[PDB]
Curated annotation (Swiss-Prot):
Consists of three domains, a large central CORE domain and two small peripheral domains, NMPbind and LID, which undergo movements during catalysis. The LID domain closes over the site of phosphoryl transfer upon ATP binding. Assembling and dissambling the active center during each catalytic cycle provides an effective means to prevent ATP hydrolysis. GO terms for molecular function: (d)CMP kinase activity; ATP binding; CMP kinase activity; dCMP kinase activity; nucleoside diphosphate kinase activity; nucleoside monophosphate kinase activity; UMP kinase activity; uridine kinase activity. This is UMP-CMP kinase. It comes from the Eukaryota. Catalyzes the phosphorylation of pyrimidine nucleoside monophosphates at the expense of ATP. Plays an important role in de novo pyrimidine nucleotide biosynthesis. Has preference for UMP and CMP as phosphate acceptors. Also displays broad nucleoside diphosphate kinase activity. Ubiquitously expressed. It comes from Homo sapiens (Human). Its cofactor is Mg(2+). There is a cross-link at K71 (Glycyl lysine isopeptide (Lys-Gly) (interchain with G-Cter in SUMO2)). It is found in: Nucleus; Cytoplasm. Residues 31-61 are annotated as: NMP.
């Protein structure tokens, strides 16, 4: 079970590239944020009632639940099809405590091949989020909530990038270019490694 973590703030173009990587390379894309939201909404589910307790208390849902959901999706995907063993994971990790939790709980159970980091300047990210907003119903987010979210994402994930750099595992991508230019960069990486 091989994992690639996909990092980058909002507007960085992750969504488009992940879909592209899934088609060409047969990776399975997991969204940590959407797996949690769906577990919460099923009160039927494994962890729905547990998540309900944390919500009631005004408390953050522990990363341990998130890792369990990621691990269950990986285990189920492979029990159906032992060949579908490569995973793109986004929405996790969000900070270095999340990442320590992963490394303590998942060693001997999954290998992180590498980390993809979609990088470009705040302004271009922000414009993307705003134009996606306008052109559909409308966004909750205005310019200054976006800039705040981008700033604190870069601050939170910097130690993750620093750490994976140290072991030669960061593949930086220039996310300011157009969809197909960026994907050419993504293809150079995945054709090499895997």
């Amino acid at each position: 079970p091989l994992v690639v973590f996909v990092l980058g703030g909002p507007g960085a173009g992750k969504g488009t590239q992940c879909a592209r990587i899934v088609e060409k390379y047969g990776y399975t894309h997991l969204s940590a944020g959407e797996l949690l939201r769906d577990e919460r909404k099923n009160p039927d589910s494994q962890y729905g009632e547990l998540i309900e307790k944390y919500i009631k208390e005004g408390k953050i849902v522990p990363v341990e639940i998130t890792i369990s959901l990621l691990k269950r999706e990986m285990d189920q995907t492979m029990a159906a099809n032992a060949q579908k063993n490569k995973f793109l994971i986004d929405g996790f990790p969000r900070n270095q405590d999340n990442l320590q939790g992963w490394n303590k709980t998942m060693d001997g159970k999954a290998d992180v091949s590498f980390v993809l980091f979609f990088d470009c300047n705040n302004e271009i990210c922000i414009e993307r989020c705003l134009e996606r907003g306008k052109s559909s119903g409308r966004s909750d987010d205005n310019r200054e909530s976006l800039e705040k979210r981008i700033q604190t994402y870069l601050q939170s994930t910097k130690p993750i990038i620093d750490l994976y750099e140290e072991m030669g595992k960061v593949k930086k991508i220039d996310a300011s270019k157009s969809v197909d230019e960026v994907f050419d960069e993504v293809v150079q990486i995945f054709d090499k490694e895997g």
